[PDB]
């Protein structure tokens, strides 16, 4: 199979939780920190 054509409606994934929850700011900050310290790159390399 092939995947021709350009792409539209670009908006990435995310982890959801209810409007009130004590984990919100910590979760977002942890994702950013792991991202940039070089973690999502390695996981992308080794899984997809």
């Amino acid at each position: 199979l092939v995947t021709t054509g350009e792409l539209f409606f670009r908006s990435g994934f995310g982890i959801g939780m209810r409007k009130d929850s004590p984990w919100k700011q910590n979760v977002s900050l942890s994702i950013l920190k792991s991202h940039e310290n070089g973690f999502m790159e390695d996981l992308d390399k080794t899984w997809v």
């Binding site: 021709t4 054509g5 350009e6 792409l7 539209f8 409606f9």
Partner: protein
């Protein structure tokens, strides 16, 4: 094989070549040897066994060789054109392609009955 233009075209061309050779040999007044030589010349076999009688036959043979070279050039041009025309089926270009924007009966697609594509398509009027 020699399919792309017409098989009947090659059959007619061969019949015309044989008829031209037959009239040429009638004009001489080694017919089999001459026919083999002509076949080799048109196939570039280079037998070289032809024995023309008159200069008119020589001129006719030169004209026939030129016509055969022209036919070979046309056949090679057709082959090159077909090679250039590779990938007959084009590629759909995103959502802006009119042939996919306009629904038809030969194209069918669908994503998921409960997803985000559903929301994106329903909200965008």
């Amino acid at each position: 094989f020699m399919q792309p233009f017409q098989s009947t075209l090659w059959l007619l061309v061969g019949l015309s070549v044989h008829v031209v050779a037959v009239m040429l040999y009638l004009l001489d007044r080694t017919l089999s040897s001459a026919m083999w030589f002509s076949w080799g010349v048109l196939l570039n076999s280079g037998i070289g066994e032809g024995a023309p009688r008159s200069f008119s036959a020589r001129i006719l043979g030169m004209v026939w060789a030129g016509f055969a070279m022209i036919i070979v050039a046309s056949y090679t041009a057709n082959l090159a054109a077909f090679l250039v025309l590779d990938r007959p089926e084009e590629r759909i270009t995103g959502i802006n392609d009119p042939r996919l924007r306009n629904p038809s009966d030969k194209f069918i697609y669908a994503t998921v009955k409960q997803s985000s594509v559903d929301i994106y398509f329903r909200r965008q009027v």
